[model samples]
Target chain A: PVEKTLLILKPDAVARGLVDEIISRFKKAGLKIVALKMVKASPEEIERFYPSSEEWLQSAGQKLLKAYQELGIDPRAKIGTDDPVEVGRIIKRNLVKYMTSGPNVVMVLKGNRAVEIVRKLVGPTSPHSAPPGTIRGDYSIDSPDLAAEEGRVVFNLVHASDSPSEAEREIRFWFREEEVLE
Target chain B: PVEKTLLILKPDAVARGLVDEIISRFKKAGLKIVALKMVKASPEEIERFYPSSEEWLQSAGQKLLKAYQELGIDPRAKIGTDDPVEVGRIIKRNLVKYMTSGPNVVMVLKGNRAVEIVRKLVGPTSPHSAPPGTIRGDYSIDSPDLAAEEGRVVFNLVHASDSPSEAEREIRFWFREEEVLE
Candidate 1:
């Protein structure tokens, strides 16, 4: 059941000096770090990592609408449309801009059920709702509403790939073959 | 070449919010974390980890004497004895006391040359003498003299076993067989 996953310590984590804290959790959980690097991504590079598939756009757009609602704002009135595709586009743009704004630490982790373990450690994408023991819950208070109000993505501290296939793709996108030691 | 070593995030590190930051370094460096726990160590537990071997006593005492000399204070004048054993005993007692004063995060890491890698990351035992880029050098400034004057152990942020045998002894001392995952 040994597996591998990609993890990114986003710019906010590095800027706030939480780099070591986040990485230590995974190691403490019996995971192995197989590869790592720091990169200041270009917009194009960032875009490549986040696929703009139809499913993602619809889901992300719905989330964006929900965020505005949570913030006591009407998405249709404020943004002039509730079209999921249009909303998704805006969310994607904001994410790209924020992600490329500063340097990020990218790493590949390996272990038994490494992907699931990392996800559990990182917690949910929205820090406001993540539980206390999880990384996001403990370190961050940013939420979708706050991010929308601030005109940026939710400042979650880290990102773990959702699946093995996605992890492989993301790992390959960021690292060359020789960069990941077996 | 897979090997295992013991690492402890000391009280200072945990209190200062460097737990994840310290752990992440090892993960990013391709090491595996095999076990981890947080414990408020008992004095007896601390003593077992730092055995009062004659060699260690002599070396530690010499280091203490050198620290005093560097501070322009003679060990004989301040502590009334230059005997390595006596000085070593004092230092050991202080270390045990300090380590037991608060909670610490203990972990076992596995990888190629895990011990060496951890040692390199942790820098030297004396943070004042460790170079930049090492964990101690980056995060701490306490020297032996300063700690002696303050009546405390040098507040280096983390501890790594110095050798394979030492790692084995320490790993067993701190963790039971069932605790460490392969």
Candidate 2:
């Protein structure tokens, strides 16, 4: 079935001069860029993009705790709380801060199995574990543990919507219908 | 109508670390990457990729001559050839040499209007004249004159098949049936 997905080349890609290279990959993959724009996302905009549901918080929090533990830093000692909700709040805050740090290229891509294809191209969320040939794998080396040590989000280089529903929400959050090209 | 096209991110893009970036653009543009490989083209392979027709020679030769003239060089005095065929031979020789200098990432992209869409993303062959949003326009600054002065082909960064027939020919030349994913 035909699908639409959202992709964002994060500020790290822009800072490292990977915008054209990254964009060309998707184009070569037979994805149509129905909409594209560059924006320095406000805090509110960034916040709106990530859901604050308990499932989200717990999942994110677990990753954060694992990263901290792997780095030999106690999450409770470092962040002052081990509660998933509290840790999630910290992760979300950092995400908003880091995502708003610079300009990002937002795009709406359309094609068959777009979300899945884009995810494969982007690789795993952690650049350290993403295999070679994926966007993050080729360009970045940051791990969750390293990012935790550095007190930053993992520099994975891009964000692709995880599912069709997620894509619809993200596309709406980032672009208006009038902005997309037919 | 659905179409398939060939694209190559040239040696220059590899040298500059643009393989993923360039590939991602095509993928994001709703193009399916049905085939992908890294290859250092042999002289024979490069020769086979370009048409040896006199029409191609004259057109390409005219562009070279125009660039030299624009740079205030006498094409006849500099290259010692007024025949477009001879001039084209010189250009083709350089192209083969330069294209074989390093590794290139080649892909076959498939989608509705894939050929035309890839070309638009690639922009004009000459980076000098391609507009700002195109791959060449955004990433490359070299011109024909500059390349001529340097005794090289213009580092325009990429090549996309110009037409459906050309795409078919190029794809077949570059990939065996087994090499394509679908």
Candidate 3:
């Protein structure tokens, strides 16, 4: 049966200027891009989205701060600190850090076999241990600071919906106005 | 900077027996599969994962019903009217719909250039509108039904996370206890 799934193109993708490059993969995979848009996720959105992972929520800001620091950008002082300004600066700094360091992409895909086709194309999550030719194995970095001690956390490269339900939910979450194609 | 992505093969892939075909694509594309597993979503997980889409949650059962009807499978008679029973029936129907259709392969993809590379392989969202020789163009069925009246919906074959943050959130959502490979 045809199924719906969600995907996200991260700030890394936008920062790296690989929007077209990333979008192309789904096109190649034979899935349908039902919805597409670019919007900033407010702290609220992030909270709601990652409610189960409070640690992630708390630390994500730190990660962004570190990434910006690596990129030599300041979110609070130079940009000025209104809420939106802070958010924008954080986003901009993070985008540059991740992108210039390496860009990333996000998206939602659809099709009869979308879930399977997409999974095959993405490979594995861990960069260090991933085999050659895989995304992480080929393009990732590992440092003590970035490590998740339990061995669960590694800076891998992309997010894809696990099921049709997820796909539908995410597609709506990110692109609420998008219509469902047949 | 490296990244990891989450991917799921979905039930259809297993049912259609396209596991190898799909996995081969990722291998050929040069992505690494760090963490791998097969799982069915729990109802709570499904709800949690797709919290934003009330319509999807409400109507998914009907959509599956429609799909089964199209397939000439009548599950209504087989299911007794009870919450657990109904839920079990729905899951079974969906599973059969998924399994008889296929099994999914879920994994994390890793690499430095994983994001861009995967996108290149995935191609555009809708194969119907995508370039010839792309996956969707080669394997999809395009019609107005696959499009939206208000705007475009996902018409592609697969999904990819655009940024590092997104990748992190999604990977954790799907594989809570698992550690990402180094």
Candidate 4:
């Protein structure tokens, strides 16, 4: 509870028209919105943002394949192979196609109690175990891990500042040129 | 654009130190918050909500004088003068102050294009603002103006509803509940 952090109201939240609803929680929690803006993350921006997740990118197809398998569906219908690149290709195709479906609001928040405050307010990553009133718990249902036959991804609702240091780093990273408003 | 409007961030803004820099110009174009807040007004709750006016209040003292002179003063001092009593007195002295500085937000904005969509974005003047960017400015100015001034007032930043329905009603007059934020 002794730091600042960054948050991105991802495209999904924007498409879902939950920007204000999502923002209200932060406001309610009393985090100062140091910087804010609505921007469409380009492929480059996303790549930069998720730079260290090459494995995540590489395995994304596998994850989807696993998801398909869990759903008892054939990935071959789309790519006809188990190749990771092929799967990645298909995923990227869909990702780009729907990428601009919405715009995201990026923010930098600060508080002596910022990190813990956001984490608690955001609740558990998964909805099932998350308490009611928490962002995720209130708005989401489990993500059907149809691919791995894993249960649905319930913690899909909101992403928060994970740690104070991480918050400081990420906030500076995303809001390099922005000024703190509050 | 033609009709001059009003707005107040309430005591919430001051307690949090977000006086002019963030709340004043909703989005430049010099959209002034003709009326604003730095204190919580009495008769705590009210149904009607709108941007309050500073025009009607009689500022017989230096506090009020200092406040009115603020717009023309240094933005920093304006920030320093953010006292709850000054805020409350502004509201109370001017009947509209109560409406402007009520527990919630209030604002009156103007533009040649105002009549077309201001109220609609403010969300029936009940739970939210007009559009994603208009005043109440999307309800996300993070931090509560919760400081104690010489008086017992609580500061909540400014609020504004952009349009004319209330413009005709004179913010100083208390209308039926139906006439305000319903």
Candidate 5:
């Protein structure tokens, strides 16, 4: 099915000027860039950008634990919680802080199976866990555990929407329908 | 020493939409993009974009012959000249036609040894000879002989500045002061 997804080349990306190269990857994959722009996100906007649901927060916490263990660090020692929802809130808080730190490039892209394709191209959340040639693998070395130890969000370089419906909502959040081309 | 270079994501690049990934290679090498934009290259601009000198044109012709021979095709039978200068004119003609066929993205980039860095990142002019992870190697496979056989230009996806002085001239040729941000 034809669909659209949102991708953000985060603050870390703009600082290094990796926007064109990263956007080129999706295009090469045969996706269309329907909309694009740079944004200096407000803390309030960044806060609302990510999910706040209890289940999603806990999901983030669970993944965060696995990375800490893989890197030989104690999750509890880092964020002081083994409880997923509470730890997830900490993760979410760090994300908002990082997102609001500077400028970001945001855009909507389209293709058959666009949401899943964008997620696949972006790689996993942690650069350490990302495969080679992916956005994270090719350009990032930042890790979740390292960021946790430093009390910062992992700079994996981009944020891609999770699902088609999620993409629809995210696109609407970032851009008015009339603003998107095709 | 710190310096700058010019690069163009050619007509083939914007249409196939490979600009971002290609630009990313320069950034990954730690180069900075000082300016960027898209243009529909005029035939006159495209004609001037490449060398007209007898020497460089002949050099292009010489390379074109090697590709034809390697592919077991007769160059003289095709372009009617082993004379480098004559053959080079044909190659240049094809290039201008392809270049003016669509939109191109042009940019000025900066870094220590930036000119050489960009050339190396873009790989050799022919994708057939480009190394993997380099722009041509990873994303393209067009050959000089093949393009000649088709009576078209090799779709190598980019044009990078050759040397520091040449880079300076090219950057100045395409962009004015203040249009390029430091």
Candidate 6:
């Protein structure tokens, strides 16, 4: 079945002027763009977009704690927290910083199994972990651990929706019904 | 000194999924895109973007007349007029039809002699006349002569400003002051 997915050409992609390459990559994979727009997203929008659930926070915190450990860095000295949930909040904050730093191109793509196809093309969230030839693998600048250690972002070129449910929610969150084209 | 030029990714280019290739061609020549937006143009906007002056009409009319001749077709049997200026009006009307048919991407590129640079990459208004490797040359399917014969517009992929002054005027006409960012 065909699915619709959301893709955010994050701020760094625009800054690096890789808009064409990134858009073309997904298009070559059989996806069709349904809507696209550039916007300077506010911090508030970023905050609201992420989950506030404890489960999410704990998972995020654990990921950050693991990242710091893998980097052989002390989280307490920089982030002032050993607590995973607190570090998760910090991680989320830095994500807002990265997202709001410049204009972002938000697009919706539709195709067979688009949600899965998009994530595969986008590669792993960690720039380093992603294999060569994928979007993030080819374009991203930092590993998740290094980015967390620097209190910054992973520099992933895009935000591909994780699942069909999330795709629907994320699309609705960023774009109004009127903005999407058939 | 840097100059800013306007580029309109015409409705057809968007539908054909050539937006990336077109933008990449200009950027490879050392131009920097300063602003980009996707909008569904109103008939009024398309009308205003073109000229109403007699000089323009006559030239457009003459161009169309020549196009019909090249196609070995009778202009009057098709458009009901041989007057170049009247045919120019028909040409202009068709342009409006094409522009307002779907969403268009408007972009501003700033660089050394950007107006001339952009036009060179986009190639001629006659898609067939533009040489291989240029944006319109590589992507467009229809020639101006055939387009006019069918009472349609050329499938030229982009509208690139012809002169620096014209670029300035066109940019100002399409974009608001706050919309442009350095």
| Model number with the top DockQ | 6
The local distance difference test score of each candidate is: 0.82, 0.81, 0.50, 0.49, 0.80, 0.83
**Top TM-score: which candidate number?**
6
| After superposition, candidate 1 runs with Cα above 4 Å error | B1-182
Docking class of 2: incorrect
The DockQ values of the predictions, listed in order, are 0.12, 0.07, 0.02, 0.05, 0.17, 0.54
Better of 2 and 3 by lDDT: 2
Q: Which regions in candidate 6 have their CA more than 4 angstroms from the true location?
A: B69-74
The TM-score obtained for chain B by all candidates, in the order given, is 0.94, 0.95, 0.57, 0.35, 0.91, 0.94
- The alpha-carbon deviation from the true structure for residue B87 of candidate 6, after best TM-score superposition, in angstroms, is 2.3
Clashes per candidate (backbone, < 3 Å): 6, 40, 95, 56, 2, 0
RMSD of each: 15.2, 16.7, 18.3, 13.3, 8.7, 2.3
- Provide the TM-score of the second chain in candidate 3: 0.57
lDDT of 4 by residue, A32-83 (tens): 6556545555666554454244465567667676667666777566457777
Q: Which pairs in model 1 have colliding backbones?
A: A20-B20, A20-B21, A21-B20, A21-B21, A24-B23, A24-B24
Candidate 6 lDDT tens digits, A105-168 = 8889999999988888888888787899888889876787666656786888788888899898
Expressed as tens digits, the lDDT of each residue in B1-182 for candidate 3 is 57787655555433343434554566656565555444444444543443234444345445444444555655445444323334333543443333223223456778767666655555565556666655445545553233322122233434455556767776888665424543
Per-residue accuracy of model 5 over B1-182 as CA lDDT, tens digit each: 46999888877777776767676677777876666655666788878878799889988887877777788878778777788888889888888888778767788888888888778878888898899978888999888766777878789998888888888888888877755655
If both were scored by lDDT, which would come out higher, candidate 5 or candidate 6? 6
Per-residue lDDT of candidate 3, residues A69-115 (tens digit): 67565645534442443443444444334323422223456677787
Candidate 4 chain A has its poorest 10 consecutive residues by lDDT at A146-155
The TM-score values for the models, in the order shown, are 0.53, 0.53, 0.35, 0.47, 0.56, 0.91
Q: To one decimal, what is the Cα RMSD in angstroms of model 6 from the true structure?
A: 2.3
Q: Can you give the lDDT of residue B84 in candidate 6? A: 82
**Regions of model 5 farther than 4 Å from truth:** A1-13, A16-182, B69-76
| Chain A vs native chain A, TM-score per candidate | 0.95, 0.96, 0.58, 0.66, 0.91, 0.94
